[PDB]
């Protein structure tokens, strides 16, 4: 069975690079039961605080590579090396909040503290997996620490999330608590699966606003990733505690945490 290219770019040109879709596994057509968006949307009054005088910002006259950058200090330090990658000493288990530079900073748009706001740079592909439906994999080697993509979707309150009947695309910001629901509106990140041996991590980031209701979710590689490797992050125990009553994990890792065999041993 050939691996049919079925969409040249599921992002319709909204990302820096195309995201093709292929399926060499079954007959499932290119997913179209959602609206691809590259940035978060709202479907009720959120009124994100965008008051430019409310932004904390830096006064740097360099490239914001020094430890005196206020934006870096709000992040404990700027965690981006010279190439835009997270430092090796970055805490991949309890990631800090990242405050990037913004439109109030005196620095230039290309300073060292602007990785997530500059968008996707790696070649990704939406593909049909063997056991998990659609997935996302790398079309290039990706060094550890590289920004992959943002979890983009519909901004909704925790109360609205509690009413909705499909939480398969719901990312809880864990702040009043708000969520990103990618069920109806989403980007490439809604197709990234759970892996008990993840290779990307979510990190909360502020960029062009600092409304603490709405951190933005940035995925970075937690290790070097080989070409063709599926991308995945740890959906978390709360997800699998709820979803256990319906299905079990198919990641096939020797340290799988939620497989039938694994849960049966409990």
Ligand X SMILES: Nc1ncnc2c1ncn2[C@@H]1O[C@H](C[C@@H](N)CC[C@H](N)C(=O)O)[C@@H](O)[C@H]1O
Contact 76, 190 (CB under 8 A): no
Q: Which lies closer to ligand X via its Cβ, residue 3 or residue 62?
A: 3
41 is in an annotated binding site: no
Q: Where in 109-128 is the site for a copy of itself (CB under 8 A)?
A: 109-110
Based on the shown chain and the rule CB under 5 A, indicate whether residue 74 belongs to the binding site for Zn ion: no
Based on the shown chain and the rule CB under 6 A, indicate whether residue 236 belongs to the binding site for ligand I6L: yes
Q: Look at strands 35-36 and 178-186 and give their pairing.
A: parallel
Query: If contact means CB under 5 to 8 A according to the sort of partner, which of ligand I6L, Zn ion, a copy of itself, none does residue 171 touch?
Result: ligand I6L
60 is in an annotated binding site: yes
Based on the shown chain and the rule CB under 6 A, indicate whether residue 153 belongs to the binding site for ligand I6L: no
Site string for a copy of itself, 34-73 (x = CB under 8 A): -x-xxx-xxxxxxx-xxxxx--------------------
Q: Which lies closer to ligand I6L via its Cβ, residue 128 or residue 183?
A: 183
Coil, strand or helix at 142: strand
Work out the angle at residue 196's Cα, subtended by the Cα atoms of residues 80 and 228, and round it to the nearest 5 degrees.
65
179 is in an annotated binding site: no
Of these, 46, 132, 208, 263, which contacts ligand X (CB under 6 A)? 132
DSSP annotation of 177: -
* Residue reference for tokens 């809604």: 190
Work out the angle at residue 253's Cα, subtended by the Cα atoms of residues 247 and 258, and round it to the nearest 5 degrees.
30
Q: Where in 178-207 is the site for a copy of itself (CB under 8 A)?
A: 185
79 is in an annotated binding site: no
Q: In sequence order, what are the residues at sequence separation of 6 or more whose Cβ sits closer than 8 angstroms to the Cβ of residue 178?
A: 155, 156, 157, 158, 213, 214
CA neighbor of 235 nearest in space, from 99, 164, 132, 143: 132
Binding site for S-adenosyl-L-methionine: which residues?
132-134, 169, 193-194, 250
By CB under 6 A, name the binding residues for ligand I6L.
Answer: 167, 169-172, 174, 202, 204, 233-236, 238-239, 242
């Amino acid at each position: 069975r050939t691996e049919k290219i079925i969409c040249r770019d599921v992002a319709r040109g909204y990302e820096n690079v195309p995201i093709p879709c292929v399926n060499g596994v079954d007959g499932e057509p290119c997913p179209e039961d959602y609206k691809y968006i590259s940035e978060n949307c709202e479907t009720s009054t959120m009124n994100i605080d965008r008051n430019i005088t409310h932004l904390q910002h830096c006064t740097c006259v360099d490239d914001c590579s020094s430890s005196n950058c206020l934006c870096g200090q709000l992040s404990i330090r700027c965690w981006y090396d010279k190439d835009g990658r997270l430092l090796q000493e970055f805490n991949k288990i309890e990631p800090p909040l990242i405050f990037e530079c913004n439109q109030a900073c005196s620095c230039w748009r290309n300073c060292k503290n602007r990785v997530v706001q500059s968008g996707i740079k790696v070649r990704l592909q939406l593909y049909r997996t063997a056991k998990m439906g659609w997935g996302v994999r790398a079309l290039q080697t990706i060094p550890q620490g590289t920004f992959i993509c943002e979890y983009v979707g519909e901004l909704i309150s925790d109360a609205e999330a509690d009413v909705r009947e499909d939480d398969s695309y719901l990312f809880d910001l864990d702040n009043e608590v708000y969520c990103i629901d990618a069920r109806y509106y989403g980007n490439i990140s809604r197709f990234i699966n759970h892996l008990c041996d993840p290779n990307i991590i979510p990190v909360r980031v502020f960029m062009l606003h600092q409304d603490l209701r709405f951190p933005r979710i940035a995925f970075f590689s937690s290790r070097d990733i080989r070409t063709g490797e599926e991308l995945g992050f740890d959906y978390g125990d709360r997800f699998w505690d709820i979803k256990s009553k319906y299905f079990t994990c198919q990641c096939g890792s020797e340290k799988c945490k939620h497989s039938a065999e694994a849960i049966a041993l409990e």
